[PDB]
Structure formats: C-alpha cells, structure tokens
C-alpha cells in the first residue's frame, strides 16, 4: 500500500503545516500537524475541556462505529516550548492520503495548554518519530507509520514541504519526479527516539564550506533551524544590522536587509536554503525588525533541523531495520 497527502501552511510565514486525516467511521476529518519529533497521535475531542476549544475541529468517538476505548490508557506530553496536552485513548481506523490503519491509538485530549487553544487551525498532532517516545501508559502505543509499515510497499515516508506553498507527505514510496539530482542518505541514531543525524558542515552565502559535524534532529514540527551559537553567529554576521536580542528572544534583522543563503552538508552533498526562507517577518505588526529563521540551539540541548531547513529539500525517512535519512535538492 501507499498514501499521499497534501500538507498546507497554516499562515503566510509557513509557521506550521496541516494535513487532513480521516479518523473513524464515518470519517471525521481533522487537520493535524505531522511531527517527526514526537510519537503521539492526539486530537482535540468531544472530551476536551470546553473552554480550551476555540475553533478547532474535534473528534467525537461516540459518533464513530469503529472507535473503542482503550481501557485504562492515558497519555500526557510536553513539547519543546513547554506546551502540553493530556487525555485518554481510543483505538479507531485512521487514514492518511488513502493509506488506512485499523486499530490505531487515537489519543483524545481532555486538556490542552493555552498555546494549543489559541491556534484554531491545528486540530491535533500526528507523531512520526520512533514509537519508543510514545507517552501512552501503561501500554505504550505505536505510531501511525509503525502500524502502517508492514503494509507499505517500502517502509518509508517522505516530506516535501513547500516554501509559502503546499507540499506533500508520501507513505510507502519515493516519488522520483519530486526532486532533482540524487538522494544522499545518511545514518540515523535512534538512541533518543528521534530522527537524529549528523550534518557534515555549513556555508554562509557564497562563502567557503566549513567541514564540521553537527548532530541534530529532523523535526517537521519545529518551524525554525536551531544550530550551535558559533554557526548562527557566523550567519548573522553577514547581515547588516542583525543582532541577538535578549528581549525578543533571538536574532533579529532589519526588514530592509537581503539575507544570504545557508548551506548544510549531507555527506558529500549540499542543501541550499535560500535567503528568503530565513525571513520570518516583522517581530510585531508594523515593526521594521524581522525575526530570523536560523537561531541558536544553545538553550535547547539539541540542534534542530526544522521546517526552514527541511523545506529546502526532499526528505526521505527510511524506517527499515536500520533507519536512514535521505536528502535531495528540489
């Protein structure tokens, strides 16, 4: 089997992308944020505290003939910014892009934090990291991908995120028309449950490539590119007027500035992030200070190749017995 679904930016900055997911029978379609940095499939639901729902589409298990309570199972998760959600668990049929899994654990939120309530466009998250990160207790549950794998033509999924445009998540095959050149594959460490890999270095603009190992995670659920302070400082040094603002929470730059590209290495291959992809717009409406798309990971503990980087590539998440990541230009 295979599946293919379009993912759409939730706003004009590509802050996140949403993909329609069918849950239950008859289908209830929710728009979920596919997140390669977590391993829970959770949704706003008929059980979510009413005051915590503002515009989201909800899953109502009582209206699904295939839903069944997973008795005794609970879940609770926090993300990199401290946002969080928790609840109980149903099993139900879940389809993405034509690919169906029966008995998928669908984690129904009872509680969601303020930042979730405030985003009316995201109905929940679909986690694509390794199932070792799944928060369901007492019996950990598998991801949609881990459940689908044995049915898939090839045990892969691909992310082709667009710049200010829709993209595509494919399951079970590699669309050879979606990229240019070759796909360079690199090793993955699953020791922390993430799609963790090591870039071979970087360049700023037309500058010399600096060969240096940068360990980080491929996280579709993160907007920006988070890299060591050394690397980040070297980037922003090439932008007139750019500075790290403590009050704003990162590097900002004058809206009048033209940004250089940023290149990262994948083996002997190179992925170029255009400068335009690094502009996240005014810090507040009407400001002439803009927020940068490359930021330091120094506060975080890990480097994160989020959407700014990933959208410059065709990315293959190879879930074979020994996982690997592939990157191509597009």
């Amino acid at each position: 089997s295979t599946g293919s679904a379009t993912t759409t930016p939730i706003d004009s900055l590509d802050d996140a992308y949403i993909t329609p997911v069918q849950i239950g029978t008859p289908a209830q379609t929710l728009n979920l944020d596919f997140d390669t940095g977590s391993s829970d499939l959770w949704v706003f639901s008929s059980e979510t505290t009413a005051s915590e729902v503002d515009g989201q589409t909800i899953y109502t298990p009582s209206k699904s003939t295939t839903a069944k309570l997973l008795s005794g199972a609970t879940w609770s998760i926090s993300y990199g910014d401290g946002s969080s959600s928790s609840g109980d668990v149903y099993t139900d049929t879940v389809s993405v892009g034509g690919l169906t899994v029966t008995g998928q654990a669908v984690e129904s939120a009872k509680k969601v934090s303020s930042s979730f309530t405030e985003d009316s466009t995201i109905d929940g998250l679909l986690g694509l990291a390794f199932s070792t990160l799944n928060t369901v207790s007492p019996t950990q549950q598998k991801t949609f991908f881990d459940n689908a794998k044995a049915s898939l033509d090839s045990p892969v999924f691909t992310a082709d995120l667009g710049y200010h445009a829709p993209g595509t998540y494919n399951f079970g095959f590699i669309d050879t028309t979606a990229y240019t050149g070759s796909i360079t594959y690199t090793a993955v460490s699953t020791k922390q449950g993430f799609w963790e890999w090591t870039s071979t270095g970087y360049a700023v603009g037309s500058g010399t490539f600096k060969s240096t190992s940068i360990d980080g995670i491929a996280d579709t659920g993160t907007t920006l590119l988070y890299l060591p302070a050394t690397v980040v400082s070297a980037y922003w040094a090439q932008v007139s007027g750019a500075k790290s603002s403590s009050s704003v929470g990162g590097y900002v730059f004058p809206c009048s500035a033209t940004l250089p590209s940023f290149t990262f290495g994948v083996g002997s291959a190179r992925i170029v992030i255009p400068g335009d992809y690094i502009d996240f717009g005014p810090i507040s409406t009407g400001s002439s200070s803009c927020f940068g798309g490359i930021q330091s990971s120094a506060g975080i503990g890990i480097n994160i190749f989020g959407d700014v980087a990933l959208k410059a590539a065709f990315v293959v998440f190879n879930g074979a017995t020994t996982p690997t990541l592939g990157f191509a230009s597009k």
Binding site: D15, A16, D33, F34, D35, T36, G37, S38, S39, D40, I77, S78, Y79, G80, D81, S83, S115, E118, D119, L125, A129, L133, T135, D219, T220, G221, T222, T223, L224, F280, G301, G306
Partner: peptide
C-alpha cells in the same frame, strides 16, 4: 507563533 514540536 513559532512551533517547537518532545524533549
């Protein structure tokens, strides 16, 4: 907002 999907 920016997003930061689990530590």
């Amino acid at each position: 907002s920016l997003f930061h999907x689990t530590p």
